[PDB]
Write a protein that binds this ligand. Sequence first.
Ligand code: HEC
Ligand code: HEM
Ligand code: HEM
Ligand SMILES: CCCCCCCCCCCCO[C@@H]1O[C@H](CO)[C@@H](O[C@H]2O[C@H](CO)[C@@H](O)[C@H](O)[C@H]2O)[C@H](O)[C@H]1O
Ligand SMILES: CCCCCCCCCCC1=C(C)C(=O)C(OC)=C(OC)C1=O
Ligand code: FES
Lengths: 85, 383, 54, 124, 244, 59, 71, 111
Amino acid sequence: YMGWWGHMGSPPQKGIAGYTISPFAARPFAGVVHAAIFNTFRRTKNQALFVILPVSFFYYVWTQASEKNEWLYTKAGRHELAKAL
Amino acid sequence: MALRKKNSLLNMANSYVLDSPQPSNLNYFWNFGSLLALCLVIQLATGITLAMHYTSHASLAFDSVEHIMRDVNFGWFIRYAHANTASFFFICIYAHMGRNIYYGSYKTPRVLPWSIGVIIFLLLIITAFMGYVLVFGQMSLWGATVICNLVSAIPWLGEDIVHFLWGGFSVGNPTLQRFFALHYLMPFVLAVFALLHLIALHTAGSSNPLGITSNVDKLSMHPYYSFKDLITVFAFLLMFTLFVFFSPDKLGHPDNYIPANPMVTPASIVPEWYLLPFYAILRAIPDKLGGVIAMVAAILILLILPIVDRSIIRGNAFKPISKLLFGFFICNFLLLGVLGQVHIEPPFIVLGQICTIFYFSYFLILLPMVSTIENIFFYIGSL
Amino acid sequence: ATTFYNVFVKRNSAFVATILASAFVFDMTFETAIDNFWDRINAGKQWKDIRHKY
Amino acid sequence: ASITSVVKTSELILKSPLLSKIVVPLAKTYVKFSGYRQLGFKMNDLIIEETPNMQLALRRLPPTESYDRVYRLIRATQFSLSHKLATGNDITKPEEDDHYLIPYILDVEAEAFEKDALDNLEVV
Amino acid sequence: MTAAEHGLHPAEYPWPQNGMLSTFDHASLRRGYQVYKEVCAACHSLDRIAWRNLVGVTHTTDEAKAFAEELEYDDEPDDEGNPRKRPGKLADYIPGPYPNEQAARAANQGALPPDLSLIAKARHGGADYIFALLTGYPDEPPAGVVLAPGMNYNPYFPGGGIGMARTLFDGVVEYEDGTPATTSQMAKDVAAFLTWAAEPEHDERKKLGLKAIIVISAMLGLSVYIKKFKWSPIKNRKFIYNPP
Amino acid sequence: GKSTYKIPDFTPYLKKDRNTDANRLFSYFMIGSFGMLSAAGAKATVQDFLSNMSASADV
Amino acid sequence: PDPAIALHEAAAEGPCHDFKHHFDECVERVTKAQEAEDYDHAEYKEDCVEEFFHLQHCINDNTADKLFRVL
Amino acid sequence: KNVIIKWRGKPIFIRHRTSEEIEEANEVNVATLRDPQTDDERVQKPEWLVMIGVCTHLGCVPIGEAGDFGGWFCPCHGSHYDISGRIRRGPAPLNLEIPEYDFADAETLVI
Ligand code: HEC
Ligand code: HEM
Ligand code: HEM
Ligand SMILES: CCCCCCCCCCCCO[C@@H]1O[C@H](CO)[C@@H](O[C@H]2O[C@H](CO)[C@@H](O)[C@H](O)[C@H]2O)[C@H](O)[C@H]1O
Ligand SMILES: CCCCCCCCCCC1=C(C)C(=O)C(OC)=C(OC)C1=O
Ligand code: FES
């Protein structure tokens, strides 16, 4: 499923013209400030829910479990601990 | 014809590191492969060096590690580099496996590099487990004991096998000397399998974040990915530096600075952090043999991803529901990790069982269902 | 700039020689600089600072 | 899963009035959130092609369709590596998201599945 | 587990060595050695430390040779093969109070005082735990605590009952540098000394780390420039498509 | 859009002084500095690391 | 004398007064309970470790930095 | 009291059981026991519980007097052994093994 240079296995290409300029002719950091602020904000905004939802849910689960565990091993939690075991 | 192409030896290097045709759009998650190669090289260099100063005999082992720390020039560095790189090796391998699962790298035509990969992961676990025993501190001894008794769960011959792996009736000098020899060997085996999974990959080439063919648009591996790999090499070395020089013991257990004592069992025996999720899965099943099966199955189940993923599309970039499911799967794997190091107490017992069920149901139920539904949504949605 | 390029950069043999000579100088000067800086931020704490009492 | 499967199941849903009433709006939002149109792709551009069946279907595409697909893949790869999205006419409009490949793959698969059946025929 | 079973967690004290760029205070190290020598060494060994280790850290070559030369070590047998003793040398290890575990336990109501060479690394808390433990014996155990025989109440110790009694009291040591030897001062000094004993490369390690951080950061910056420079023809690529 | 002789707009990226020796020299300064720190870092690494093989303090 | 003595006393009477009173009340209850007969044949014997920990944790938070500043 | 004698690297728990301890052990119906055994099968002398003090689950040493059956509790995975050293609760499948021991004298046993 992959060939090599000259016969990579692409369907025939026709009609595309590609253009680029030399690394020495270009400013490598052109538009860096705009990218760093606006591009990163857009990319992050669009992915935020996919991180926030699972992280927040599992953090809540952990928080509840660890708080209960702490409470069960206090004096106040004696009776509830006795039942739990 | 250029020498790099003409000469058969040079041509093999050329095909992997120079002329190798890569997708032009690999993102930074494609950099863990080279980080894993870096960890392997650091572990070989530091490991062989430690072997020049370490004594595998149980009467001298712990002391030989102290001699390395205290007397050998830069021995402290070589020791801490070796110990911390073992952790970084697992961070990079989990990232690499995470990348592979998210982007569907396990799908045809890359089932074989993925399946060899699963074996590499098992070899890393065994390598790291045996290396940890070599210190012969309290965590070393008891770690060996407990893990080498998982073989007792095997019916009939199980106990005989345990004594065979110990070279006696308990973990002792025979076990330590054999773990040294095997710890030395295993990284070479691991390097061979790492080479095999690359050769297997070379038939399809790298996948890419869009999940489409890159045959239309290829970039040479050098100089583009060479120089892109340097960025993460230096980011890695920064992380390495902060641990090795400023916090060398953050990832370790203080009890491993106590010499092994077969009588006293330490208050809490937990594995190294990177094994913690598998230990939580084992605790979840009350039965001995049940627990062992579950724990091994948790790794071997990765081999069925090619089958249970029913999607007509490779990878999760364009699959919102699959992305949510993947997020929950990863966070559950981290919760299992955390539960691996809590005390066996309420309510963590039941929580560990729920997280274990979720772990397996990802492979067996959710991914097959979600991938089926998304297929239908793509078709109806674009009509 | 032309002159500098022509002398130190154009020939790779010269470029590599310049890089290695610079690395040698950097190594020696950076050593000395860090030593002094480390001694100033950790002043009165090191053995060299109390040695004179003994 | 085979394209045939996906197409048949979809047709069962589209038939049922109740089912279509609840599934079609969900599928349209799924597609909106999927965001492949924002890289100038058509849905069919995303289908896994590294299989004998799909290689055969792609070889049977009309040359013009084939040339256009090559361009959309190259263009999307350039957006990907630049971390940009399509703008203006590069965005795939819903009316441009045509199933150009589905007919070809359904024919390739039809034959492949008939061949499997007939390889197992039993003279009665 | 109950908090008692865990032990109270020690405060985070501002040690001189806390801080990416901070060494130990060597004057504190020297004072801490004096506390070890005069108080702890009665029950605790420091087996991993040789006299040479003190030299250029806490003591001059002459002071350390003087410490070594006051002791007797086993020599090689004489010509009739009879045992002999010799005076100590810088290569010798600091000798412990007891010949074996059995003798150690007999002297300490069954408890075995650990060797202190690695104790700062072998306990969660490190110096803070050592300082907290030594200074954290309450005059009276909290009402309701039943101590086992030979045990002393200390909340920092897991379970609360430790076989080691309080040993630091104001003025048990007379420091040679004129520092007032209060319980707190002595605990701070000895905790520092023991931390040094566990990790004697500490000072050199952190200085080399500073050098590494600087070089590696610069290399990371330059690697980002070079990557962007090399990749710009690919990033900047433009297409015109004319459908055939 | 159609004519392939109308080069796409590269003005946001083109440097005016692209053909000058000063322009090249700058980029070689960056490459050279990187090579220099890599050389100094390798030398430090090799020297410190190999020193483990010299007689240890106890010897 | 030991600077810690004064600093600890000051912190107990001041910022950690609620916890001081809790510990005190606990001690009173437990001593009284031990005074009562057939205490030795009781199922549950209350201690004051919990309250003690809360007090000590508090004192340490208000003192640690001050103490090391005067050594 | 319970002693800990090293024997082939394994710990040996030797408990000098009181009368009432023996009684407590002889109560549990053999029927409800993962590993069904009575104390009489375990000890050859009711006053000398001699066991291999390694937990039958994975191989840690149980902390004695602790438990829920007030014999031995393995801290590793929370398995509870009895005054006979029988498993009552937790992952451990078997009762704490008994070594081959003989009373040469009434004051000394060999293992
Ligand atoms: C005369 C006896 C004696 C003196 C003096 C003594 N110790 Fe100890 N120490 C012990 C005993 C016994 C233990 C073991 C306690 C136990 O495990 O219950 C111990 C335990 C310790 C522990 C470890 C507690 C743990 O977490 O296991 C540290 C640290 C310690 N001692 C440090 C010191 C320092 C520092 C000094 C004096 C400056 C000191 N000791 C003086 C007898 C002594
Ligand atoms: C020593 C450990 C390993 C090393 C050094 C290693 C190295 C590499 C390298 C260099 C690549 C190509 C570049 C990249 O995609 O990052 C790669 C690709 C891959 N590796 Fe690994 N690998 C290791 C372990 C694993 C493991 C544990 C798995 C799977 C469980 C795995 C599965 C793969 C797959 C499927 C690919 C192809 C991904 C793609 O490009 O789409 N590898 N590996
Ligand atoms: C994949 C490669 C490797 C991994 C993941 C690995 C992992 C480990 C780990 C986790 C330890 C315990 C470290 C500690 O806490 O002190 C260790 C110790 C050790 N390893 Fe390795 N190792 C690897 C390769 C090697 C190799 C090739 C050697 C060659 C002999 C080696 C020799 C040693 C020695 C001698 C020790 C004991 C001294 C010590 O603890 O530092 N290792 N290894
Ligand atoms: C990764 C470190 C670098 C060392 C190289 C790794 C060692 C593994 C190499 C041996 C495995 C055989 O590797 C195999 O070699 C040949 C030629 O070399 C490659 O062949 C490829 O390149 C050559 C020219 O470059 C073409 O003739 C051929 O059409 C193409 O497929 C294979 O795609 C590769 O799979
Ligand atoms: C397919 C499984 C690969 C081998 C996994 C072995 C390493 C993790 C095993 C778990 C473990 C178990 C079971 C365990 O019980 C234990 O607790 C005492 C640990 O600490 C020594 C462990 O590490
Ligand atoms: S090891 Fe004894 S309970 Fe698991």
